[PDB]
Amino acid sequence: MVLSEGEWQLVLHVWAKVEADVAGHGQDIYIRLFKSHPETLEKFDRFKHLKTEAEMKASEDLKKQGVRVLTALGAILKKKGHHEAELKPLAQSHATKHKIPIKYLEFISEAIIHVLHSRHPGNFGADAQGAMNKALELFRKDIAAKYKELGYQG
Template sequence: MAAADFDAVLASWGPVEADSPGYGEAVLVRLFTDHPESQKLFPKFKNLSQGELSGNAGIKAHGNVVLSKLTALIKQKGDHAALLKPLAESHALQHKIPRKNFEIISEVIVKVVAEKNSAFNADAQAALRRVLKVVVADLGCFYDEHGYKE
């Protein structure tokens, strides 16, 4: 993975980091709207109607966790095993989140960040896709270590 991809993402990532609750909420609402089957993977949110998603404090809080963790991973510039391994363990063993869902949310993240952040141009979007592809692949390796079968 090229350090240039991380640098390209981080160059436009400031607004995301400054408002991770807002971006995180937007990501989860978009995820649940565009991929309603994914909502079932979140026990706290699985019974919410589409109208109850936006403005939900729990979704905003969880979205903040997602985007804050992603920011921390990106700042590691590929040296993210120490952060990623416990995340993989909890998502594989406790939450039972299929790997494909990380690919799905990755694309949602790219779309939402591009829509909300005009500085996040096509090059930054492409770099984020490459970064997220590596993160998801590495997450999958940790899933394998835990014997997670889908």
């Protein structure tokens, strides 16, 4: 699905708030993901031992990974759909090495939306959330197509 420029601006206006503290947002998103869908934590060899939210919050390595995820996603969002180059390395590692199903990308998308909804009411009202969902649906659609090209059912 193709986003309008207005939709992209709603996406980028809340992403600007994430960027005040990408590390803190990444921690909240990972905690939400692992709490809501615990099976996703099992895909992380370095983090699957974490037992509680306190341990997740105290993990410097998890914090760094959160920053990587959100910075990679931010670069994709800033391309406003013209993210072919950015999806190549990401799809390859996630399909072949990490083996992350599309359903798990749906789960992290849900966690992103949940955290933006709680933190950023000023920039994440209904229309803004709809635009972000559209952007994440586009991301997942295009990643799923790349997964298939790479040989992974997803």
